[PDB]
C-alpha cells in the first residue's frame, strides 16, 4: 500500500510531537497556535445541512463525532528560539517558580521514593527581585525571533488515574516578539480557556498516536479538516442540549463512557472520527493553512447527540427519560 508509514515500527513516545507551525502574524496580537486534550470517545450527531447547493440541502445528516477532553491549558514557561544555519535552536528557557505537582511528578518515575527536592536552586533564585531573572528575558528578546510557550494538561481535573502531566511546547505567531515574551510572562501560572483558542466551525486538524493492533498501528498520524462542531464547558450545564432539541442533559453517555470516566469538564466535538482511542492524549492544530471553501464557511446546526448507554443495547438517552417510560421496579418504591 503506502510506503510513507513504513517500517511498521512503534513510535518513540505516546505524546504526538508537533513539527510544523504557522509562520507569523503582522498585526494580530499574541494567539495560541495549537491546543491539546484527551480523547473521551465517540458518539453520533444529527443536524440540518445548510451547505449551499447540496443534494440534501436542509435535510437531516448523521455522522460520527468524537468528543475530546480539553481541560483549561496552563502556561508554566516560555522557550526562546534563534534562527541558525542548522535550524531553530533553544538558546534559553525559563520557568514560573510555581510548577504544579502534576508537572514536578513528570520529572520523576519513583516520586514516592524521590526526595522531591527539584526546582529549588532556580526557584529560590527566581524568588529574588527579578534582576537576575530579567537577564534571560532580555537576552531572548534581543536575539530570538520565534518563541514557544511550555504548557501542560490539568490532569487533576480529568478523571484519568494519572497524576503526572506532560510538557508540550506551543509556538506563537504574533509579531514584535517582545510583545510575545511580555504576554507569556504576564500569563505565567495562568490558564487559557478553550473558547479562546478555537471557535465553532474552525477547520482545525489533530495529530495523535493510533491504537496498536496487538505492531500494526501505534504510529503518529495526521489528518486535516477535523472541523469542530460545538465547544462545551463542564461548568455550563446543558452542554448536551443542542441548539434545536435543547434537551436538558449532558454529552456523557448513560452509565459513563466505555472504559473511561464521566465527562464533567470542558470538551469539544469534532466532525468524524479521530486517531487514538479513549485514555489517550491528543493534539489540535489549525492545519497551518486556511481551507477556503464553502464546506468550511457553513455553520453548525446540531440537533441531537447519541448519549445512550454503551453497555449492551440502549433504550433511553438520559435517566430522566428511563424512569418515566420504565416506571418503578423492584429496587424502587
Amino acid at each position: 500500500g503506502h510506503l510513507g508509514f513504513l517500517p511498521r515500527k512503534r513510535a518513540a513516545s505516546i505524546r504526538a510531537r508537533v513539527k510544523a507551525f504557522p509562520k507569523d502574524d503582522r498585526s494580530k496580537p499574541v494567539a495560541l497556535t495549537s491546543f491539546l486534550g484527551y480523547k473521551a470517545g465517540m458518539t453520533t450527531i444529527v443536524r440540518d445541512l445548510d451547505r449551499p447547493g447540496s443534494k440534501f440541502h436542509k435535510r437531516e445528516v448523521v455522522e460520527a463525532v468524537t468528543v475530546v477532553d480539553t481541560p483549561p491549558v496552563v502556561v508554566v514557561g516560555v522557550v526562546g528560539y534563534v534562527e541558525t544555519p542548522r535550524g531553530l535552536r533553544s538558546l534559553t528557557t525559563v520557568w514560573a517558580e510555581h510548577l504544579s505537582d502534576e508537572v514536578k511528578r513528570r520529572f520523576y518515575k519513583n516520586w514516592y521514593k524521590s526526595k522531591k527536592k527539584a526546582f529549588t536552586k532556580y526557584s529560590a533564585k527566581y524568588a529574588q527581585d527579578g534582576a537576575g531573572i530579567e537577564r534571560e528575558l532580555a537576552r531572548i528578546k534581543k536575539y530570538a525571533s520565534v518563541v514557544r510557550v511550555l504548557v501542560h494538561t490539568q490532569i487533576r481535573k480529568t478523571p484519568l488515574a494519572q497524576k503526572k502531566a506532560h510538557l508540550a511546547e506551543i509556538q506563537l505567531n504574533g509579531g514584535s516578539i517582545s510583545e510575545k515574551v511580555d504576554w507569556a510572562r504576564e500569563h505565567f501560572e495562568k490558564t487559557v480557556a478553550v473558547d479562546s483558542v478555537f471557535e465553532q466551525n474552525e477547520m482545525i486538524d489533530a495529530i495523535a498516536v493510533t491504537k496498536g493492533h496487538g505492531q500494526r498501528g501505534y504510529h503518529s498520524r495526521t489528518s486535516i479538516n477535523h472541523k469542530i462542531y460545538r465547544v462545551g464547558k463542564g461548568d455550563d450545564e446543558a452542554n448536551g442540549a443542542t441548539s434545536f432539541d435543547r434537551t436538558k442533559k449532558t454529552i456523557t453517555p448513560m452509565g459513563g463512557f466505555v472504559h473511561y470516566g464521566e465527562i464533567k469538564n470542558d470538551f469539544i466535538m469534532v466532525k468524524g472520527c479521530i486517531p487514538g482511542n479513549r485514555k489517550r492524549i491528543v493534539t489540535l492544530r489549525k492545519s497551518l493553512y486556511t481551507n477556503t471553501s464553502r464546506k468550511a464557511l457553513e455553520e453548525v446546526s446540531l440537533k441531537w447527540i447519541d448519549t445512550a448507554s454503551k453497555f449492551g443495547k440502549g433504550r433511553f438517552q438520559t435517566p430522566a427519560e428511563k424512569h418515566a417510560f420504565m416506571g418503578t421496579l423492584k429496587k424502587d418504591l
Binding site: 444529527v46 440534501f56 435535510r59 445528516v61 448523521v62
Partner: protein, 50 residues
Amino acid sequence: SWRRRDGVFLYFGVIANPKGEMKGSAITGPVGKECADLWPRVASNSGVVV
C-alpha cells in the same frame, strides 16, 4: 441494508432505453429512493414508491 441521511437503515434484473423508460405502463414493486428519485421517468411509471 444501506445507510440513509435521515438516520435509519433501509432494505427490502430490469433494463431500460437511454431515456430510462421501461417496457411497461403499470410497473409496481419496491421502488425505493434509489429509483423513485434517481429515475424520475420510472417513478411516474411506477406506483408503489418505497
